[PDB]
């Protein structure tokens, strides 16, 4: 005959969802920078993350129904909101701005003079600041302005003790949960994954905030991947990941100086001081050769994805907000946008210098469209410079000529470009098996 015999500790996993904690690196424990935004209480990372490779195994992966990216998005939202709660509120900044220009001769730099409550509530002071044109809106004697989000939200100044640099972060599944790594070279997001391996903590992706492209990412695939639930769907965002990192040199020449302005008792807001030196503008420099070669690689894969070889025109963003139309990112503590139209203007049918992109700075920002909560980014002293290397593109196909345009806006796609190869599975160590064994009475 035959008899059942259950085994405890069986290698069985099933698709499931659970709250995943974090484990950040301890090298930042000597660079707290007063509780940096990304990591405050994250536990130290594992010194030797054991990525056990598995053989004779295959798991059905899905990066679009994946809930890891949803947890990432909600967690980043909650963390950003929590790091913004204790800082200085800027409700007294709503005031009639008697504002003029700064350019003496032939906007983007508005010298705004306004009133503000000093430390003593009885007394009131007259102070001035240099706001950007994108930061103020005209109300209809010189032209009086007011902050762009004064009538639709409450402006909160990010207290400058914290910094916005994307710290290498990790999502580690709890005990009894395994994270599967789709380590195979040729993977697109859906279908069986031949090389699947388990790991305790995630590969590690900086929480970068970006729109048109994907700064500081990682793609082991030698070719660009065209990842979308339906390439046939034109509206579907055709997520792209450049195989080769494209070095970008966005520099903010303006010598902005932080100017603390008292807005009440125990209340002070950091205004913008005189821009020392010539009045200039932020600009991003992309090597034309590198961008052309990477565009060649992406267009090759796009032609392979869409038919075999078809006319493909890289066009500028069809539409969106400032963040969507103009690629957005944080260089050295402040957020600014570049139209990136010199990057998407190549009409390709079958087959040294740097392209310079105009960049506009917008200090007051309400990113993630959380209406009712807008942040005021303080000025950062000195020239701001940061160098990154693009790894991904958020392209969207238009409705023999298939024209691609940048998209984005939705921030789930930012995380999906890196959590594409991971998934979470729970362990069910109980398993029934037939065995000739037989216990004694």
């Amino acid at each position: 005959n035959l008899w059942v015999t259950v085994y405890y500790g069986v290698p069985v996993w099933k698709d499931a969802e659970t709250t995943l904690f974090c484990a950040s690196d301890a090298k930042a424990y000597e660079t707290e920078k007063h509780n940096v935004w990304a990591t405050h209480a994250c536990v130290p990372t594992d010194p030797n993350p054991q990525e056990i490779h598995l053989e004779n195994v295959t798991e059905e992966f899905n990066m679009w129904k994946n809930n890891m990216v949803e947890q990432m998005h909600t967690d980043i939202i909650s963390l950003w909101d929590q790091s913004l709660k204790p800082c200085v509120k800027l409700t007294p900044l709503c005031v009639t701005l008697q504002c003029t220009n700064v350019t003496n001769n032939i906007g983007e730099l508005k010298n705004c003079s306004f009133n503000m409550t000093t430390e003593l509530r009885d007394k009131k002071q007259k102070v001035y600041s240099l706001f950007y044109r994108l930061d103020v809106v005209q109300i209809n004697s010189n032209k009086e302005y007011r902050l762009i989000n004064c009538n639709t939200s409450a402006i909160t100044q990010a207290c400058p003790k914290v910094s916005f640099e994307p710290i290498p972060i990790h999502y580690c599944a709890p005990a009894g949960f395994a994270i599967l790594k789709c380590k195979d070279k040729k993977f697109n997001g859906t279908g069986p994954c031949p090389s699947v391996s388990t790991v305790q903590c995630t590969h590690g992706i900086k929480p970068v905030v970006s729109t048109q492209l994907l700064l500081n990412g990682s793609l082991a695939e030698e070719e660009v991947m065209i990842r979308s639930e339906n390439i046939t769907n034109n509206a579907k965002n055709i997520l792209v990941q450049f195989n080769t990192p494209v070095q970008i040199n966005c520099t903010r020449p303006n010598n902005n100086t932080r100017k603390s302005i008292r807005i009440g008792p125990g209340q002070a807001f950091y205004a913008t001081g005189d821009i020392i030196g010539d009045i200039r503008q932020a600009h991003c420099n992309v090597s034309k050769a590198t961008w052309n070669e990477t565009l060649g690689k992406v267009v090759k894969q796009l032609r392979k994805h869409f038919g075999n070889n078809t006319i493909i025109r890289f066009a500028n963003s069809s539409g969106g907000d400032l963040e969507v139309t103009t690629h957005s990112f944080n260089c050295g503590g402040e957020f600014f946008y570049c139209n990136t139209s010199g990057l998407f203007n190549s009409t390709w049918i079958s087959n040294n210098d740097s392209i310079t992109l105009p960049c506009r700075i917008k200090q007051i920002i309400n990113m993630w469209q959380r209406i009712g909560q807008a942040m005021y980014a303080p000025p950062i002293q000195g020239v701001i410079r940061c160098v990154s290397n693009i790894t991904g593109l958020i392209l969207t196909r238009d409705g023999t000529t298939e024209t691609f345009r940048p998209g984005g806006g939705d921030m789930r796609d930012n995380w999906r470009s890196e959590l594409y190869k991971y998934k979470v599975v729970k362990i069910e160590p109980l398993g029934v098996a037939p065995t000739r064994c037989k216990r004694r009475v």
Partner: antibody, heavy 125, light 108 residues
Framework: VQLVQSGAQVKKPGASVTVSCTAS????????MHWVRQAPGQGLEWMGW????????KYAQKFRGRVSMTRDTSIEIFYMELSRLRSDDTAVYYC???????????????????WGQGTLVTVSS | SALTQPASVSGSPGQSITISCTGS?????????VSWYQQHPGKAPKLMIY???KRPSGVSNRFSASKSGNTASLTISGLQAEDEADYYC????????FGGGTKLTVLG
């Protein structure tokens, strides 16, 4: 779910016509918003769809370079602007709201059940 | 219109008739996003079916719609007086596409 549209407008060819279409009765930033133009006596035509979240848009190949459509989350108003008018542009325009939220499998190309009253524009020489 | 609909149809109340939205292999045969709007006299077209054969609430069972390969079809059952409306077939041909619309008449 109800959508008020702007009143009738009279325009000259070569000018620019902009129309409004408010939103009420649902969450504003969770449903794509098609724009549909119907010429009097002809077939039904499409202009574009707006994603109110981040303001993502996508136009029609026949209308690329002329149409420009935006929105404001504050007042929940859908703005459709059409420039470089022609004789055939004389029509009544409709704004269509989807059935399902923007997160559905085929959300931006679903039935667009909710339709506004409609605004008619007269572009005559 | 890429969705080839016949010019017009006529009939009487009570019986059941059909209308077809014949398309190519890329609009209706390639994709299952078929639909059937109903334009009202000088008013907005309201779809009666929303997929290959899906209908939302707010429409009687007399509208049976399905796709016969490359030729999608709609059936008007138990014709009545209020059925005096033109019906537009809708499909996603790598983008929105509207049919030519068919005139329909009862007892007239």
């Amino acid at each position: 779910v109800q959508l008020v549209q702007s009143g009738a407008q009279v325009k000259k060819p070569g000018a620019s016509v902009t129309v409004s279409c408010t939103a009420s009765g649902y969450t504003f930033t969770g449903y794509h918003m098609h724009w549909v133009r119907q010429a009097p006596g002809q077939g039904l035509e499409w202009m574009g769809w707006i994603n109110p979240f981040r303001g993502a848009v996508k136009y029609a190949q026949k209308f690329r370079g002329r149409v420009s459509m935006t929105r404001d989350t504050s007042i929940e108003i859908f703005y459709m602007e059409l420039s470089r008018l022609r004789s055939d542009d004389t029509a009544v325009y409709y704004c269509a709201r989807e059935m399902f939220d923007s997160s559905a499998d085929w959300s931006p190309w679903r039935g667009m059940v909710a339709w506004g009253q409609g605004t008619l524009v007269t572009v005559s020489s | 219109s890429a969705l080839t609909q016949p010019a017009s149809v006529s009939g009487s109340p009570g019986q059941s008739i059909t209308i077809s939205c014949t398309g190519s292999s890329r609009d209706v045969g390639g994709f299952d996003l078929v639909s059937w709007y109903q334009q009202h006299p000088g008013k907005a077209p309201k779809l009666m079916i929303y997929e290959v054969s899906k209908r939302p609430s707010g429409v009687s069972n007399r509208f049976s719609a399905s796709k016969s390969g490359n030729t999608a079809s709609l059936t008007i059952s138990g014709l009545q007086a209020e059925d005096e409306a033109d019906y537009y077939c809708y499909s996603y041909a790598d983008g929105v596409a509207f049919g030519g619309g068919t005139k329909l008449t009862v007892l007239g």
